[PDB]
Design a protein around this ligand. Structure first.
Ligand SMILES: *[C@@H]1O[C@H](CO)[C@@H](O[C@@H]2O[C@H](CO)[C@@H](O)[C@H](O)[C@H]2NC(C)=O)[C@H](O)[C@H]1NC(C)=O
Ligand SMILES: *[C@@H]1O[C@H](CO)[C@@H](O[C@@H]2O[C@H](CO)[C@@H](O)[C@H](O)[C@H]2NC(C)=O)[C@H](O)[C@H]1NC(C)=O
Ligand SMILES: *[C@@H]1O[C@H](CO)[C@@H](O)[C@H](O)[C@H]1NC(C)=O
Ligand SMILES: *[C@@H]1O[C@H](CO)[C@@H](O)[C@H](O)[C@H]1NC(C)=O
Lengths: 30, 30
């Protein structure tokens, strides 16, 4: 919701997405 | 849940899939 320029006290990190790792697992392994 | 023939007042639209375009993203990745 929104962006980083409105909230007070936001910090920097990375949010893990389960779709991409799962994707690589399917095609290469075959 | 269910289908369109039981509810009263249902309208027609399209429901966006976050996975449908992302499966095409998988196609690209391949
Ligand atoms: C969180 O990270 C962003 C970068 O993703 C930081 O944004 C930078 O802010 C400085 C100061 O205004 C700019 O000089 C940089 O150009 C910005 N980066 C980019 C990529 O534009 C942000 O300051 C970070 N916030 C904290 C609290 O560390
Ligand atoms: C919502 O859309 C569906 C089609 O997806 C409509 O169903 C049609 O209904 C008429 C009237 O009974 C039929 O002649 C058509 O054959 C139906 N379409 C299909 C593809 O079978 C439905 O009427 C729409 N509802 C509203 C409220 O607009
Ligand atoms: C929290 O308080 C410190 C002072 O202890 C201040 O430097 C900092 O900017 C404050 N952060 C926020 C989000 O208010
Ligand atoms: C809502 O009311 C209108 C009359 O103003 C009627 O034509 C319509 O069929 C009604 N719809 C439902 C879902 O009851």
């Amino acid at each position: 919701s929104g962006n980083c320029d409105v909230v007070i006290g936001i910090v920097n990190n990375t949010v893990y997405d389960p779709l991409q790792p799962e994707l690589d697992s399917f095609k290469e392994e075959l």
